[PDB]
Amino acid sequence: DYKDDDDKMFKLNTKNIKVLTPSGFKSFSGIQKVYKPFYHHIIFDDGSEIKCSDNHSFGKDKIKASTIKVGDYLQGKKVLYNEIVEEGIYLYDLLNVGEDNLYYTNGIVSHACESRGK
Amino acid sequence: EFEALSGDTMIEILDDDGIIQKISMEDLYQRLA
């Protein structure tokens, strides 16, 4: 019926690369490549946009795309567009960013997924 | 379950040599390839 083994390659961050976060440049454990059959295309009054999954959290408050409605403000930026586009797309995320899991994506603070931790 | 960003999403990274560079999420993947 359904399988999530599409592009289950995964790349480990063995190159000592860090990403700019609210906590500074922080080291992430790695990056995952996943296939998502639908995503949200959000555009802000800031002019920047974000294309992410439905329940992808942004700021520290676990603010997910689907909970954001047009007219709201995300981190000081008014969301003018938030369409759920149901098209299969390849998606990427950073696993365990420093010790915060917050990082800057398109001038927006995003929340990283966690592969490390019990 | 997954909940990631699109490959065209731009991030700002710091490489090993201490180089700051803005690249897309997918480019970061190819950078670790």
Structural summary, described in words:
The complex is a heterodimer of chains A (118) and B (33). With 118 residues, chain A is an all-beta fold. Chain A has one domain (1-118). Helices cover 0% and strands 48% of the residues of chain A. Chain A has no helices and 10 strands. In chain A, the strands form 3 sheets. In chain A, strands 1, 2, 3 and 8 form a 4-stranded antiparallel β-sheet that branches. Chain A is globular, with a radius of gyration of 15 Å. In chain B, strands 2-3 form a two-stranded antiparallel ribbon. Chain B has one domain (1-33). Chain B is built from 1 helix and 3 strands, in the order E-E-E-H. Chain B starts with a strand and ends with a helix. Chain B has 33 residues and is of the alpha+beta class. The longest helix of chain B is centred in the last third of the chain and has 7 residues, at 25-31. Strand 2 of chain A pairs antiparallel with strand 2 of chain B, so a sheet runs across the interface.
